Amino acid sequence: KAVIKLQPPWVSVFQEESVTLHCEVPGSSSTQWFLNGTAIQTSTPTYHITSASEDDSGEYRCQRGLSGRSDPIQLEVHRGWLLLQVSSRVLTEGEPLALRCHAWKDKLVYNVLYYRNGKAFKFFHWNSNLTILKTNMSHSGTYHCSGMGKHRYTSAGISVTVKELFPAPVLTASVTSPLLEGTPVTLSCETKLLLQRPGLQLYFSFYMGSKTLRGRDTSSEYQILTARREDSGLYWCEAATEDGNVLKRSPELELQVLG
Template sequence: MKLLLSLLERLTCQHFFTVLPTSAPQMAVAELVKGVPWIFSGESVHLKCSVPGNVSAEWRYRWFRGGEQLQESEYFVLWKARPQQSGKYYCQGLRTTWISTQHTLHSLPIEIEVDGGWAILQAPPLPMLVGETMTLTCRVRDNPRLTEVILYKDGVELQRQPGPELRVTNLTLQHHGSYWCRASWDGRRETNSVISEAAPVSIIEVLTEPVLEIVPNDPLIHEDRMLLVCQVQLNAREPVPHIHYYFYQDGLSLGPASSQDRVTVLRDSGQYWCKASVPTLGLKRLSEPVPYGRVTGEHSEHMRNQKRIVVRQSPFRMRHNADQWHQFS
């Protein structure tokens, strides 16, 4: 009888545990709540760890730098930091239930740079967009009253200002590079001057140049048709505007503007390209032409000339009859 009860108990437990729902592990979030990522030695930063959507849950938090576990707490304070404490900091949430201890995925890292020098050029940590204005700040240890700040890019002087803030307006891709600053101030008997370490600045286009992909054998469409895909990236601030897509063959439009980045067309030889337009930003870009089937060199040169004037075509003209253009769905 005892053996029978033991087997029944074991089977019941196994059945119970197999029906428990499982979910993908969550990711912890590490954030900088006080201070800046690039600090002077002797300064402090405050970090916080959390698990989104679990305010009432009894989570504990572990902090790491690289592969080293630091401490277990919700907040982590780098107090009077030293240069040796520079690195990537991240956290993990964990909680103990009646079944087991659950662990979240590690958070994305926050990189803290502790500078032992006298000057720091604070630059945007994320890429800036073409056309925007960038503000750079030349910080000097102990905050003396500066008399002159010089901004350099890739070894070339860009501007001089009496204060620590430097602004670069109407950014272009040519502004991508390494920046540093030289700050000067008057001491008791002499003028002091210090130079910061170089800070990288990344500039990206709002709308990249489209790339047209021709997929002649897509299993989801009819065998006498092929798929055109217009690949483009929109790097815009919130709210993100909509992209309008246009497709062309041999200088003629294959249909009206669409919010879809792909269309299906009859399989036919010719030169194809696409256009991406963002009307709210006044932007439009054309892809390079892509040949399909038998296209002669003379035909290719003619199509390159057609590409230059295709933007001015309005209203659109169908390449074939109205049944030929189909949006991909």
Template structure:
């Protein structure tokens, strides 16, 4: 019988029930145990005691890890020996004994991270059997069932600057160099918290006009676990740096121009540069200042024009003012100064500039309205002045 072959020993019968001891080495183990039992009787009866021993053929076997399994379903005892003090029918069954080459590994957090940027070191802890002290073991590490470090001789897995994505359930596997013996650890949950929140870029005004001042603020908050951490801030426009990293969390433009429009963002980092986070892009459009809106003035001028036109039409139809030079042979005269300015201008247009016998009535009315508006504009510019018009040789001259 070779050491790697399972040994089945028929001990005896207990009230007609077969009692067998099944000895098998652990999966691929280099250590092949042998079962011995005391007393070495062929028959065991109800009430008698029996001790089974998992022997590896060496006095150093006591340093191994032993496992006893009944009917291949559950572990009933751990240790080199297993004793039945009072035999009973329910103890009948198939018993197996395994001697482990190395103990079940345990994953331990040597340097346990709390927040982003912390160093993390995990150790896969196990111990070899003194019978095989020179056995080469290999270690692998997993996060959420995915391998993060391939099998190798180091029994540690380290992350220099832990990030949020490094959170998860970690475990490790240990195997011999030939891969025949392999065992896994339990799971170790690791949760890494934020050092600071994702920054948010805020603008001082919802609408920025040309030549206005503009202030951008990069807002974030530190973890209460690291309140003393120094943060640095940088600002970007269209991906180009406009303010280098510094302690100020604001970027200001004293007089915004159209060229300052663009997509702005900010970046925050720890003083050692291990943790960096960027904000979302914020589009900012600098609007040009609108020129003086002449709409009210134009509307007022049109309204005045309509009123003047209505007034002149009323004057024309009812002949409220007679031209003083209608008698044949008299020269045109300038309206007297005691007549109000607007009436004077109307009389001047009727009597001097556009006599009825020279310009058709419709054209004369249009021309008259335009001249009155011109006279009104002049009177607005020079308040209190008197406009005197004379006509000589077909030329018009204005005196103030």
């Protein structure tokens, strides 16, 4: 399925502003646009809103040539002094989020505050945006901002959700410590996907102390064929996405092997 890109990337815009939606994937210039589950009478791979209005607010989806239908982007068009713009309303952990305290008519505000759930968390003398390069669930919340122009003005709140993909793993062993020399032991890097991600596999690696035991591989198990005394130590693992955007480690487990 396709992917909609916004230029500028803000999902919330003021009345009369412009934004260009880009339907992206090679090939066919015959794009179908959907606004609110419903096709639109233009069909370039770019949809330009020249001067935003309440009629542009809603759910956008796109189909180009032969691909599937984008996941939907919700564009909202507002009136107000200050708008807390975000690059996405719903993200998976690992993905970046940009936030902007945007003044009406591009007017100047200074001493800007960003808030999450009613609590200010960042102050700038000069109006700057915020980027969280690697979100996680704890960045979920209702964001707003305030800034000083001729007076102090405050934006309305906007809800952002960041979804956990998999909890941090737990390293387990197939036998209770201490175990006898010669015993086989299987270590397992245990976690589970929290979201349906059809072709998605996690990759696992195993450590003893700071030492690499086995590098990144699709197996979540590591076999010690015949335990020896020298295997006594602390064991842990990492679980990652294929591309390493989410990478989490386990606590260390104490494993003792007796002679």
